[model samples]
Target chain A: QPVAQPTDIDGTYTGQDDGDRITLVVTGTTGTWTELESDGDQKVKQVTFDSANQRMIIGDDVKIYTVNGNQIVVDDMDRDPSDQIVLTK
Target chain B: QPVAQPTDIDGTYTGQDDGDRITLVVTGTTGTWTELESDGDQKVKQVTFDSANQRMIIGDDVKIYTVNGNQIVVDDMDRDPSDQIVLTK
Candidate 1:
């Protein structure tokens, strides 16, 4: 069967890959990311979730992406080598 | 919001937490576990998935369980403490 890109993922989410709690807000290609315990939001100009390819493009372009229902993972190799963020809707 | 136990988890799934590739066959309260690369079959008598509580009752009463869409994890502590098998439908 064929699967389409997720229409969901464009909402407020929080969680991650052994990292600090983060708040990722998405609205189309625009979004924001901020650590829950930290402040000052980081604006993301291009936010693309490729459910078909099992990857995503966010700030610095995330290298890995995975979404299972309400839970999603965003791994960025642009910054920290193992920097990953997993959040739930 | 209320979430009912998953009606899905009952199918063939095979991945995991850094373990050998496994094939988990679920048919209601009965199921079978077999190492994909190996044919050693293991019989399971009871299998209960509680998506509501985010836990499962399987061989030896698992201690932890997680299902995300087609992905499922079976972590049993009876035999192997950190034995967690993650399979996808």
Candidate 2:
């Protein structure tokens, strides 16, 4: 069987938010994301995308991000509005 | 962040069982698998592996597979005993 090739969003992307470096990799319908701590440690999580909605739901929607051009504006569902993170490729 | 490299099971593998062709690709803690229909269409699903348990859980355990040597013996949690599927690398 032939699987459809993933779209342009399939690649390694990196950005910074509040002094933390974040890396996201999208592949097909699943991906992985990580947040690097200042001490060099990191927290990793799984991610899935709803291409139709242009949203990336991370770790059970702990964070939700919508793709806009090369930028991915993230909403930290658990944080205050001011703590929203914006990531770019 | 530096993610640890995936284990030896990280690769594309294919096998046939009961006339159905299956392909599985394991990467890090995540992977994807597909079962091909006789008409050439396919059903694709996401998968995650528990290295310690040597088991690969697919789509909420619709099926569970354990790695033994070069073979992956699969148990369809929804099927009768005779419907178990075994795949090999």
Candidate 3:
């Protein structure tokens, strides 16, 4: 998928990514939002890219998380790296 | 009368004796005793001699006091000397 612009990624996202697969859920407009990749760990990891590395930078309040995507079955969206989503390359 | 022996003075006795007259009530057989003197302060003082020096001694347990003999109405036997009463001449 084409990378989303950093400016367009201003929202809370949760998911995880292995070296390959990725899954992401981006919440915008509060309760109104979109789930980009629900099951694809590859897409999750793909969504974990830092928008700042590109021309897009998430807002200061934007948060993201990683869950048990590739290796573990339990869906654990570890919120630790959520804030660093903008830095996720 | 003759002086009473210290060994003979075992029971409790109360009274006074002056240099001349003596008043004494020696209780020997408990409730079945005799009344020696009735009302003479002079006799009270005379009875207070310690038999040890007198060739006669009051018993060790005996207590003596000085009532208003000379000037005061309160006769202060002053038990401090009772232990040494036998030595009172």
Report each candidate's C-alpha RMSD, comma-separated, in the order given.
Answer: 15.0, 12.0, 49.4
Task: Order candidates by DockQ, high to low.
Answer: 2, 1, 3
Model 2 quality (TM-score): 0.41
True contacts kept of each: 0.00, 0.00, 0.00
Off by over 4 Å in 1: A1-5, A16-19, A36-46, A76-82, B1-89
Candidate 3 has what TM-score? 0.14
The candidate maximizing lDDT is 2
The positional error of residue A7 in candidate 1, measured at the CA in angstroms, is: 3.0
Superposed by TM-score, candidate 2 places the C-alpha of residue B69 at a distance from the truth, in angstroms, of 37
Ranked by DockQ, the better of candidates 1 and 3 is: 1
Q: Candidate 2: misplaced stretches above 4 Å?
A: A1-7, A77-80, B1-89
Best prediction by DockQ: 2
DockQ of each: 0.01, 0.04, 0.00
- Evaluate residue A71 in candidate 3 and report its C-alpha lDDT on the 0 to 100 scale: 20
Ranking of models by TM-score: 2, 1, 3
Estimate, for each residue in A1-89, the C-alpha lDDT of model 1 and write its tens digit: 11334655678777754445666677653356655433544433334443433334443333445667777666553435567666887
Name the TM-score of candidate 1.
Answer: 0.35
> lDDT per model, in order?
0.53, 0.62, 0.25
State every prediction's TM-score relative to the real structure.
0.35, 0.41, 0.14
